[PDB]
Amino acid sequence: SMANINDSKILSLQNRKNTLVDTSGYNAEVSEEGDVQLNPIFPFDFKLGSSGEDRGKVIVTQNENIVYNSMYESFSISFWIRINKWVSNLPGYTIIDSVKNNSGWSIGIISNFLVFTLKQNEDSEQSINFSYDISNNAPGYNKWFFVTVTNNMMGNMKIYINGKLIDTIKVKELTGINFSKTITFEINKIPDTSDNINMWIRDFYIFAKELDGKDINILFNSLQYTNVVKDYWGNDLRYNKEYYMVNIDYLNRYMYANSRQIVFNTRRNNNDFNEGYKIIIKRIRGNTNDTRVRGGDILYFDMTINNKAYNLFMKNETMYADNHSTEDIYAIGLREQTKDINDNIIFQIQPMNNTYYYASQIFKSNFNGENISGICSIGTYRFRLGGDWYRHNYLVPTVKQGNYASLLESTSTHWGFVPVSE
Numbered sequence: 001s002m003a004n005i006n007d008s009k010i011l012s013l014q015n016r017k018n019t020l021v022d023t024s025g026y027n028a029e030v031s032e033e034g035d036v037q038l039n040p041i042f043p044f045d046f047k048l049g050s051s052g053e054d055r056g057k058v059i060v061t062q063n064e065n066i067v068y069n070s071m072y073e074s075f076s077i078s079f080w081i082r083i084n085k086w087v088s089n090l091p092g093y094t095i096i097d098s099v100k101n102n103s104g105w106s107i108g109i110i111s112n113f114l115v116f117t118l119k120q121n122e123d124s125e126q127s128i129n130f131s132y133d134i135s136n137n138a139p140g141y142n143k144w145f146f147v148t149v150t151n152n153m154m155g156n157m158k159i160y161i162n163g164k165l166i167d168t169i170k171v172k173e174l175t176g177i178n179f180s181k182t183i184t185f186e187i188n189k190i191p192d193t194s195d196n197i198n199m200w201i202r203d204f205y206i207f208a209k210e211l212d213g214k215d216i217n218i219l220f221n222s223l224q225y226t227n228v229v230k231d232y233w234g235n236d237l238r239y240n241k242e243y244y245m246v247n248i249d250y251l252n253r254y255m256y257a258n259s260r261q262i263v264f265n266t267r268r269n270n271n272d273f274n275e276g277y278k279i280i281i282k283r284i285r286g287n288t289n290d291t292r293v294r295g296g297d298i299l300y301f302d303m304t305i306n307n308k309a310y311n312l313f314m315k316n317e318t319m320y321a322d323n324h325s326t327e328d329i330y331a332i333g334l335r336e337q338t339k340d341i342n343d344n345i346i347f348q349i350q351p352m353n354n355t356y357y358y359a360s361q362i363f364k365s366n367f368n369g370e371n372i373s374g375i376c377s378i379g380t381y382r383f384r385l386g387g388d389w390y391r392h393n394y395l396v397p398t399v400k401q402g403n404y405a406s407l408l409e410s411t412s413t414h415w416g417f418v419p420v421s422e
Contacts, residue, residue, distance in 0.1 A: 002222050005215050010066050011183075011206040013058075015044040020058060024205075026066050033057040042225075042236075043080065043144075043202045050093065050187035051196035058185040058201075070208035071179040074155075077116075078148040078211075078219060079204040082234065083197060085140040086132075087271075088112050092190035095199055100180035107149075108190070112141065116149045116159055120174040128159045128167045133356060136251065138270045143358060144200075144234030146220050150210045162355045163217040227295040229351045230358035232273075232418040237293040237360075239286075241419070242278040245301075247378045248359055248414035253395065255279070257305060258385040260334045262312070264378070264395040273418040279303050279312070281417075284341060284367065293349060298369050300345040303334060310334035311345040314364055314374075314399045320382040320391065328402030331383075332376065341367065348372060352414050359414040364399045374401035377412045 012024040015038050022028035036056035037047040048056035079096075092110040099106050102122040108115045112134050117127040128149075132141040148160040151171065158168045187199055203223055211219070229237040232246070245255055253264035254276030267275050279301045286297035293299070301312040313335045319326035335345070348365035364374035377400050382391040400407050407413055 002218065005207070005211065005219060008207045008209045009205055010070055010208045011060070011062060011204070013060060013204040015039070015046055015202065020046060022060070026063055028060050028062040031059045031061075033059070039200075045080070045082070045200040045202040046185075047198055047200050048185060048187050049196055049198055050189065055186065060183040060185075062181045062183070064181050066208075067179055067181050070206075072153065072177075074150075074152040074208075074210040076148060076150045076207040076209065076211040076216075077205070078146070078207075078216070080144055080146050080200075080202045080223065081114075082142070082144045082200040083109065084142040084233075085195070085197065086112075086142055087140045088134045088137075090197070092193045093197070094186075094188045094190060096183065096185055096201075096204075097188070098180045098183045100182065101178065103176070103178040104180040110190075110193070112137075114147070116157075118151070118157065118171075118174060118177065120177045124174075126157065126169070126172055126174065128157050128169055130159055130161050130166050136356065138252075139272055142233050146223070148211065148216045148219070150216075152210045155210070160213070160216055163213070163220040164355050165213060226351065226353075229293045229295060229349055229360050230353065232358055232416040234358050235419070237281070237417055239281050239283045239291045239293060239299070241291075242280055243417035243419055244273050244276065245279045246273075246416045246418060247397070247412065248357060248416060249378060249412045250395065251416075257303070257334055258394070260310075261383060261385050261394070262303075262332055262334065262397050263385070264397075274421075277303050277305060278420055279417075284346065285369070295350045296348065296369070298346065298348055298365055298367065300341065300347060302337070305334075309337055311337055311342075312397075313342070313344045316344075319398070321380070322382070322393070324379075326381070328374075328400060328404075329379070329381075330374075330399045330401065331381070332397040332399060343367065347376070354414075357414075357416060359416045361408075361413050362415055363404075364401065373404075374399040375404040375407050375413050376400075376415065377407060377410065379412075 020030045034054045034056045039045045094108045096107040098104045106117050112132045113129045115129045150158045231237050256265045256276050284298040315331045315333050319329045348363045350361045352359045352361045362376040363372045380393050
């Protein structure tokens with residue numbers, strides 16, 4: 001319960017009815033300048049750009065008293081943020097700034113780092129950061145994430161990402177630090193260090209105390225619909241929409257097909273998701289009020305090749321592997337659509353989110369989801385495809401039936417859905 005956490009909330013920047021407002025009760029003034037885009041749908045984010053003189057700018061001016069009573073001891077700052085395209089060699093940008101007369105705090109991004117800084121004065125600072133895994137994010141860390149910074153002058157400065165502690169350092173003496181009542185959201189290139197980047201922000205809160213990990217996680221979860229499956233960037237997963245389907249174990253592989261067998265090939269364009277075939281998700285059972293995909297939904301997958309649409313389906317053929325057994329393992333392949341929903345095309349999805357990615361698990365299901373018989377995975381098996389006279393190894397999607405529970409903890413069962421730009 002949020003009740004006790006909220007007693008210490010001193011700023012609650014939100015988009016309410018196409019207006020940015022402070023809902024904390026302290027009535028900070030909120031103003032906008034330039035190109036600021038408000039999202040009318042959940043999560044109600046605002047969007048800023050880095051390019052142009054009409055560059056967007058959100059200015060929050062707080063009541064001087066409430067900052068003075070709060071920030072000099074212990075405080076917490078939390079917010080959802082998304083950056084695109086957050087490439088590994090990004091130049092330096094200040095993004096959320098509360099520095100005045102060379103003192104205050106500020107948040108910036110540079111390379112693969114998001115940085116929170118206490119500025120004591122012109123010559124003194126103390127910073128902490130989150131750095132994303134470059135090897136796991138060649139196309140950029142372009143996903144929504146939840147930041148929480150906590151500070152205690154008699155203790156530590158900490159930063160959390162999606163409810164996990166990432167960095168912590170003892171706060172040094174910061175005699176004479178003066179906190180500003182103004183916070184400015186603007187993507188401001190730092191000169192003495194290219195493409196436009198966008199930043200999306202929603203639910204930017206400040207608390208007048210140091211939140212512990214438990215409360216941070218309660219807050220984290222209170223700001224999400226955890227049964228709404230997410231696409232790779234953290235936005236709601238949708239039916240009837242094209243995605244590139246990826247396996248978490250094999251992000252450098254795109255999805256292809258060969259003789260009605262789906263196979264995974266190595267990407268040529270490692271800095272993008274723009275190769276191979278796309279899938280569209282089709283609802284069999286779920287919430288008909290919208291086209292969002294939810295855990296427990298029954299569904300099937302379509303793939304179009306040369307203007308012809310196929311269903312993904314679980315094959316009933318014996319599988320062959322060099323070393324492993326293949327008991328209860330079945331290839332997922334392509335079959336021609338029919339008038340009726342055949343049992344072998346049917347799956348049930350569940351969200352599977354991680355600190356550093358948004359994915360799902362996909363289970364083989366019957367029409368009503370009363371019989372869940374397997375989980376989708378991936379592996380290297382021997383096939384005769386195309387013109388093959390001999391059997392060759394292909395990396396293919398599979399369903400593991402039998403006692404599939406053993407595979408539940410495997411990242412090989414985690415599937416991401418990257419939205420197509422076109």
